[PDB]
Symmetry: C5
């Protein structure tokens, strides 16, 4: 039906003349995973192309579109899109190549394929884990400059659809939209580039329950010492030491999961402030013990330091929490 | 025998006319693995197709079906099924492609292949680990709409068989069955979709023995303090502190295995209630020590608080367990 | 030499007539790994096929066998064996495909290839780690029923050889042998199936030294308490608590390595019995302390409980060990 | 257009005569990851080739360059570059091969491709983590010696461009530049080799906060003992022991992450010196207890050892830190 | 130039007559990694072949060798070497297949390729980590017996070269050399086999510092108890218990890294002897406490046991170390 043997498909339509326009639209099937250690995400989508080539015209009386097997895609000419700044990708091939080709009697062509991509995304963790991130996926032609191929969104802002099933267990997904920009390479020229943009927001419940509550409970345990007879030395000393030693484990367990950045995160501040709060309660009792021994040496109830600590330590911690949650909201 | 050189197999049977019907049936060989962190499962199965094409007719006197090598599959026309919402898949190829082709003298065709698939499954962990999940595998044609191809289960509900060897170490598998539904894509049209459905139920014995028993034993250890002379301060203080510090480790060891969901699970409730039960026994003795020191200061047996705690703490824990196992059964 | 252009190799020898017999023999090169979490093993072997096809006859005066390059395998007809219930496999291809083809002047053919397979194996862990497992590898034709192809072991029981280098660090390997059985699929018919069977036995030394000895040592540490003055409360209390808290870690470290089965293993019994032995020694001293305080209240040496515990606890543990190693031998 | 059927492209241009010159230039897209355990890095780049072949001449009036599909690359002759000392690499192929071919009417050719490489890099950890590393990527022709192919940087030092987005979370990247050298293989001859060089510098903030601070805090905790009444034996003994036991965990947690080198690293020195500082404070109190018991035996305030330790231990640690940070800056 | 269309390259040179000799030589580029858990190593090398075939003769006046593209390798005949007892391998293919072909006017051929291999190696850990291992890589023809192909090292012992960059962070590499042996398969015949042999020696510094020193320090901590007043029960009891409990962690941390062998390693002996040394110091004080209580009961300084332990325990440990390092050197 299609006159495939007649023509040299190594050359584009309009070869030697003005640029060929090619339109694009997209449907996202899933957003698959995200990594902070590697700074990347994975996405699966359907991608579609539109153009006209009169070498693929055929006669009919119905003026309708026809579908063809799919093994003809490797005989005709086809555009050459690639994903910019991507780590890896593939096209699906079970039970056969997931490819579709439809042609109109005047030579208009529709071409579609299903693909999975993993792409680069630079992340900022200064407000972690109360953070927000923004991402994009880039599309461009490899071989043809804007003097030979013209690339655009087919229907404007309506060119992007999203599956209603899309979900991530740790993030809220929002603000899908599309943009365009021109790009330059020194050795080869100017190119059109298409963008798909979106925003992510992290859920905090896991981190409350797994980090912020136990640190608070250790701080509250250290306060119990102020309520115990100053004469019970082998009770008051280990009570403080054990809380110091636990707070160290919590600090280690948090930071072992993240990338080794060169700046402080919002969770680090909270944990290290709680550490100094616990550390100071040990020096307090050391002072009380020394001053009591001096009194014994002079001579040979509740001490004022205990009496004041019972008020001062909790008030200070409450002030710190008010400030912190005013800053990070 | 088969006139393969005579015809253009880029076009379907009945091209330009009414839709071709294609029937399907399936046998599941194994259900291979399941992930909560990734929310997916893996399955291996045999998949079969049935249709008629008169371009593949041949003469004989016996009216019987014949089997052909398998290298002819890439010369003739073949339907184009794909698995919807799937992460990855392949066809087996040792010692050769695991493919079968049988043809009748009137052009009826039987086509079979062996495949492994990994597929998406959304999971709810609010009753974990006493939870039940339901899953499905989706089948659809990539290129042809319901105006060109008609897809149906060959024998109705009898179209699905299951291997007697199928098993999972952590789940009971039940309720295999098949359904159909129509699907719409904005840019390309209407399609028939086939479903395979099943249900999973988790075994709880591992979690009893590995989580619920040790937390109970820590709670029962904290009660021993009420039976010890109030004068033995360096004994009664560490006995409580060490149980608090162990309960924290159990809490951490559980949640380090699961996805970071934004809601509380049924096991979290039990562990955090046990934590507060243990935490309170430390404040109890702090109160007894303070009140004894006040009595000493005034002046200068078993305390009522101990006497009452010996009854109140165990009764409250038993009430809590009755309620909990009434709710989660 | 071979008349390859003359014939249609899409059709088997004797197409349209009685079944073709095909003989098989095997040499195992290595048994590569085993997984309890995944319930599978990996094997590498050489696999050989024997049949006659008169379309491959050629003239000679010597009546001897000749070897051919190997690129002819994709032109002639070849049998279609696959491994049943397998997870994955491949054929080796460095520096070229590891394939061999030899032909006799009357058309007798010998065909060989090297392959690696990973296969399913259901395992029972009720006597773990003193357990024994049995495994098998299954071989069958994909497309041809017993009416068209007949599959058998070439030399009877002599058809299976094993490399003298085969070894596993954790198991003793024994009892290699071969069997045959007929198989039925509802939609497609009856098939011949060949089996390779073997047995595995686990070495226990690692588990003695890494699990059973330290649990025993914790139990023996708990007994030291009975030998210490009942007046040293802050010594006798932590001595018991610390052993409870260590035994919990041993229990956790064992079960974190295995699949989450729904039944008790032989190592679980030992560890949980040792746990209760240690748990009881804490209640013992609690009783002694309470009864001493009652005597003080009445009034205002070694206690009989200590005196009896010094005999009763070790005797009971020794009785338990005699029974256990009588049952699991 | 191009006379591809006319010529034998198994032979290079100028076959049997002087060497063909081939020029190269490069743009780096990303530096992807680095491993100390494996001693390697990963890089993604665009690579370009320039040469003339008169068998690819064609007539035109415009004297301009033309772009061709890309399926012609496997028909014509093309240079054979490989990456020396590399572990693995691939060329990107979605949605098609990422390859470009441009030709001028006189037969000048431009050839480009996108690739990812993982390459060997020998590392020195004697000043870890205050260390600096230098790396390079090597390029060479596989089959042709300098008598048949001549390989050079196209534009001198201007032949290397770098993407402005390039970043690593743990390193500062600096000093990109290019060099050339001749290489010899005994069996096959002399070859031209091109180099791409760069330098890396590690950020230290993570290691301060995660290793050096907690070790210092343990040392400062051990000093508190000198301020406590020498009569409180069950307080002063555990205070020292627990710090020894914590310092061991820090030492283990650091070295579990790195390769098992045969020499001491700069972080090892700090940690083991802090260990001996803590170890000595236990022997100190042992001495005080023994000497006090001797005084009791003779007979039957603050001891001079405590009085002097309160000054000597901190001064010594401060001297050690001054020296250390003078050496490692 | 080469008459490729004239001949049947499915047949070897001298087909039907005496065996063809094929010579080999090798250059090792890198030794990439080693695993004790899997018992294997990985190697990358260049491999070369030499033979004569008069079907590849061509006329010239210069009598020199010529290089050809590399796409002709799949048209001519080529030998069929494979690596015996190997787990996996591949040939490098970026930017093209890393293959070289050179031919002389009389039909002498040189063939080269670059490859990476992973190979089996049986290891003995009875003297671990002071152990020495020996390894080899095996080379053989798949399809042709010694009656049809003759395989030998081209230049004798000079056939093996090694890159000066080769290094491993944990081993000293020594004693590279080559051997030959004949091999028999029951079903198929006799074959020539080539060997590459080498030796490895482990560096011990990591294990000194990470295992042997801390165990010694725990033993020395247990001795401090003998220097403390026998009346300080809550000090002397935990001092011993905590060292027992730490030594258990060291024992576990070592053996969690290695394969689960059925025999004792040299490091196990040291650690378990140190364990009993620490265990005995607890029974010592238990005895002293009991005997003191008996003296109190009779009645109603330093004990001889302490006095003797202060000499006996260290002397015994020093004797043990002398013997151990005399045996394992
Ligand atoms: C759906 C559609 O666009 N149909 C048109 C039809 O209305 C028109 O009469 C014909 C003329 O060729 O072209 C086609
Ligand atoms: C967020 C975004 O890119 N929105 C685009 C925007 O460029 C434009 O303003 C709008 C028309 O009003 O169409 C849409
Ligand atoms: C198994 C089967 O269906 N056999 C039928 C046979 O009964 C019938 O006589 C024949 C007529 O062509 O067609 C075939
Ligand atoms: C569970 C399920 O899908 N069962 C199907 C159902 O649709 C139908 O009701 C039944 C006929 O009674 O056939 C079967
Ligand atoms: C090894 C073997 O079987 N050789 C036989 C030979 O003994 C016999 O004389 C000949 C007749 O064609 O066939 C061949
Ligand atoms: C273990 C096993 O399968 N052995 C087979 C068996 O079937 C048969 O009894 C024997 C002949 O005596 O040949 C062999
Ligand atoms: C951009 C460029 O180099 N253009 C030149 C043009 O200036 C010159 O007149 C012509 C002669 O053939 O060759 C071409
Ligand atoms: C760092 C480096 O390689 N720089 C090169 C160098 O070889 C040369 O000195 C310079 C010219 O001044 O060109 C550039
Ligand atoms: C390098 C070498 O071997 N060159 C020889 C040359 O000496 C000899 O004169 C010629 C005769 O054909 O063969 C060639
Ligand atoms: C270690 C080794 O294999 N060395 C070989 C050896 O077989 C032989 O003794 C020597 C000649 O003296 O050549 C070399
Ligand atoms: C880490 C040094 C701690 C010193 C404590 C001094 C207390 C003095 C009380 C007057
Ligand atoms: C965490 C603060 C604990 C305060 C305990 C107060 C006890 C008062 C007893 C009357
Ligand atoms: C967990 C509850 C423990 C109760 C101990 C009671 C001892 C009574 C001795 C007569
Ligand atoms: C590890 C041996 C410790 C010995 C301490 C001796 C102290 C003597 C004080 C005079
Ligand atoms: C594990 C049993 C320990 C028994 C200690 C007995 C000491 C007796 C001293 C005479
Ligand atoms: C102690 C944790 C407090 C968490 C407050 C969160 C406010 C949104
Ligand atoms: C940008 C630094 C914020 C630090 C705030 C500290 C709140 C107590
Ligand atoms: C302490 C755990 C109790 C578990 C009860 C389970 C009831 C089915
Ligand atoms: C849906 C919340 C259930 C909480 C029940 C608490 C049982 C003590
Ligand atoms: C305490 C462990 C005893 C192990 C006995 C094993 C008997 C074969
Ligand atoms: C099948 C259960 C065996 C339990 C034996 C217990 C031995 C003390
Ligand atoms: C206690 C850590 C001190 C770190 C000093 C770093 C100086 C650049
Ligand atoms: C090259 C060894 C440096 C050691 C310096 C020690 C500083 C206290
Ligand atoms: C305490 C460890 C001693 C190590 C001695 C090593 C002798 C080569
Ligand atoms: C082969 C056993 C060696 C054991 C030596 C023990 C040294 C104290
Ligand atoms: N469109 C991408 C190309 O320009 C990359 C390159 O070859 O420089
Ligand atoms: N049947 C799936 C296709 O419609 C996907 C698409 O190209 O939109
Ligand atoms: N021999 C295996 C086949 O029968 C599988 C199937 O297609 O049912
Ligand atoms: N240019 C690399 C080649 O020389 C490798 C080899 O075959 O020796
Ligand atoms: N040279 C290896 C072959 O003999 C393997 C086999 O087919 O037996
Ligand atoms: C940005 C610095 C914050 C530090 C608070 C301790
Ligand atoms: C004390 C916690 C209050 C924080 C409110 C955001
Ligand atoms: C759904 C909330 C339950 C919380 C019980 C503490
Ligand atoms: C106290 C446990 C009983 C729960 C019964 C389901
Ligand atoms: C099979 C049950 C055994 C349980 C022993 C405690
Ligand atoms: C007490 C251990 C003896 C067990 C013998 C099998
Ligand atoms: C290079 C040796 C340094 C050791 C310092 C303790
Ligand atoms: C005591 C820390 C000072 C180090 C300055 C580099
Ligand atoms: C080979 C046995 C050695 C055991 C030493 C305790
Ligand atoms: C006490 C350690 C000496 C060992 C010498 C090899
Ligand atoms: Cl005490
Ligand atoms: Cl204590």
């Amino acid at each position: 039906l299609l006159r495939i043997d007649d023509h040299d498909f190594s050359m584009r339509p309009g070869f030697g003349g003005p640029a060929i326009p090619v339109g694009v639209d997209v449907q996202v099937e899933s957003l698959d995973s995200i990594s902070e250690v590697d700074m990347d995400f994975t996405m699966t989508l359907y991608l579609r192309h539109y153009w006209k080539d009169e070498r693929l015209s055929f006669p009919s009386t119905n003026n309708l579109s026809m579908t063809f097997d799919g093994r003809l895609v490797k005989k005709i000419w086809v555009p050459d899109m690639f994903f910019v700044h991507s780590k890896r990708s593939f096209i699906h091939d079970t039970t056969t190549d997931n490819v579709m080709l439809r042609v109109q009697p005047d030579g208009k062509v529709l071409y579609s394929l299903r693909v999975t991509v993993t792409a680069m995304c630079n992340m900022d963790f200064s407000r972690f884990p109360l953070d927000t991130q923004t991402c994009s996926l880039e599309i461009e032609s490899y071989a043809y400059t804007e003097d030979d191929l013209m690339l655009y969104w087919k229907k404007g802002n309506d060119s992007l659809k999203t599956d209603e099933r899309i979900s991530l267990s740790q993030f809220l997904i929002q603000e899908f939209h599309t943009t365009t920009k021109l790009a330059f390479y020194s050795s080869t020229g100017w190119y059109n580039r298409l963008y798909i943009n979106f925003t992510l927001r992290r859920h905090i419940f896991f981190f409350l329950l797994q980090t912020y509550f136990p640190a608070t409970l250790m701080v509250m345990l250290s306060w119990v010492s102020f309520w115990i007879d100053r004469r019970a030395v082998p009770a008051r000393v280990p009570l403080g030491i054990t809380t110091v030693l636990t707070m160290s484990t919590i600090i280690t367990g948090v930071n072992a999961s993240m990338p080794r950045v060169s700046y402080i995160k919002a969770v680090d501040i909270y944990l290290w402030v709680s550490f100094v709060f616990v550390f100071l309660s040990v020096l307090e009792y050391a002072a009380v013990n020394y001053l009591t021994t001096v009194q014994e040496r002079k001579e040979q109830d509740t001490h004022a330091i205990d009496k004041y600590s019972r008020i001062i330590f909790p008030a200070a911690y409450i002030l710190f929490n008010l400030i912190y949650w005013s800053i990070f909201s």
